[PDB]
């Protein structure tokens, strides 16, 4: 929860924070490598992927 | 025939919860060959009260059987997975899917269940409704005939919880048809590219002026059975015809019958309002009485 709130600020400042997102083009999509957690964070971290890619541009 | 010792009662109130939404439980096995739910036959649970759930759970699984038909029907008629069904056939489902989420909001509120009677008696009124609301379309009426089946079914009051939901289905399924009414009487544009309503071209020869159209026939050529919408489409359907013929002659030079009767006389009023414009348009262009004296 809060660790994802910290993870979004670092790609808002620049390039990836907690984990490696390996994508500098078409969006900086976030990979957690977890399947037992919900699907719900993947869309949210997809939207913060967009805004981090927008500020990298 | 004996199978094994009893399960728990709290496992029963969760298994009836799954068959209502359309999901198999540990005791429910959906059979695609019959499109029905199947409980195990014998002493497996069957009732902590001896052999009673063996019959009561079949009454609610059969009640759960009709719900997965309506969700099956709604997914197969959408025009993102099919391209052979009508727009009026699609609009009947659009009102059905609003009834599906009311079923989903009600099944999600049944915890905490006490016993199997407290849930089936809450859905005893809903049990009569779902049994009606599935097999009206299962015959196979389509489009305007499906619109004709639903108006008859909304006409079947002495039901007071089944009447407003079919009144709402008449309100939604007539939305594409009434959209094709006012574009035809105000400009004369035919709008649907694929519909249950038959399409005529109205091709006019340039050489002969005969009636600005030179052939029309009818799309309902001789039977003329325009059905089940307001006025009942027995006279005004012949005159939304002729005022639709003459609007583009201007161009290029408590009861389901009472609310039906409330749309009816406005549809009588505007055809007479378009008919009194083409009488004035004949007055200003023909000058017919001087030609009448000349003959």
């Amino acid at each position: 929860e809060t660790s994802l709130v910290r993870d979004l600020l670092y790609v808002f400042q620049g390039i990836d924070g907690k984990f490696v997102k390996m994508c500098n083009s078409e969006n900086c999509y976030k990979v957690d490598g977890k399947v037992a957690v919900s699907k719900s964070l993947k869309d949210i971290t997809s939207k913060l992927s967009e805004l981090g890619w927008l500020h990298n541009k | 025939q004996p199978q094994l010792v009893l399960l728990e009662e709290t496992d029963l109130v969760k298994a009836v919860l799954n068959v209502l939404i359309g999901v198999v439980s540990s005791t429910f096995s959906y059979n695609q060959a019959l499109q029905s739910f199947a409980v195990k036959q014998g002493v497996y649970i069957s009732g902590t009260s001896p052999d009673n759930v063996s019959s009561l759970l079949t009454q609610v699984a059969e009640y759960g059987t009709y719900y997965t038909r309506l969700s099956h029907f709604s997914l197969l008629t959408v025009l993102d997975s099919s391209h052979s069904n009508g727009l009026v056939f699609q609009a009947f489902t659009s009102g059905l899917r609003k009834y599906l989420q009311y079923y989903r909001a009600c099944v999600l509120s049944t915890p905490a269940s006490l016993t199997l009677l407290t849930i089936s008696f809450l859905f005893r009124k809903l049990g009569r409704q779902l049994r009606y609301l599935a097999e009206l379309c299962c015959a196979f009426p389509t489009g305007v005939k499906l619109l004709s089946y639903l108006y008859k079914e909304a006409l079947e009051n002495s039901s007071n919880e089944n009447y407003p939901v079919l009144l709402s289905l008449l309100k939604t399924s007539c939305e594409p048809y009434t959209r094709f009414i006012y574009d035809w009487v105000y400009s004369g544009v035919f709008r649907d590219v694929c519909g249950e309503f038959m399409i005529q071209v109205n091709e006019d020869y340039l050489g002969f002026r005969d009636k600005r159209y030179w052939t029309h026939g009818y799309v309902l050529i001789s039977k003329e059975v325009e059905d089940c919408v307001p006025v009942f489409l027995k006279h005004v359907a012949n005159e939304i015809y002729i005022c639709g013929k003459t609007i583009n002659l201007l161009k290029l030079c408590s009861l389901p019958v009472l609310m039906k009767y409330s749309v009816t006389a406005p549809m009588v009023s505007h055809v007479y309002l378009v008919n009194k414009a083409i009488v004035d348009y004949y007055f200003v262009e023909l000058k017919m009485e001087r030609h009448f004296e000349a003959m």
Binding site: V5, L8, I44, K47, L48, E50, L51, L54, H55, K57 | -
Partner: protein, 60 residues
């Protein structure tokens, strides 16, 4: 979800800056003045105020 709507308001701000960066790969003036005047001809004074700011600044 609350941080979504506090970042949905930059999502109007930075995305019309992304339409600004797609038009001009070059840095030569003159064609930059024809670029931002093709963005002030659009209505909707949300980014039209922002493209008027640079239209006072590329003209300067």
């Amino acid at each position: 979800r609350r941080l979504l709507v506090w970042t949905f308001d930059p999502k109007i701000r930075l995305k019309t800056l992304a339409a600004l960066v797609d038009h001009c790969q070059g840095r030569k003036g003159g064609e930059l003045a024809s670029a931002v005047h093709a963005y002030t001809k659009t209505g909707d004074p949300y980014m039209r105020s922002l493209v008027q700011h640079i239209l006072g600044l590329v003209a300067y």
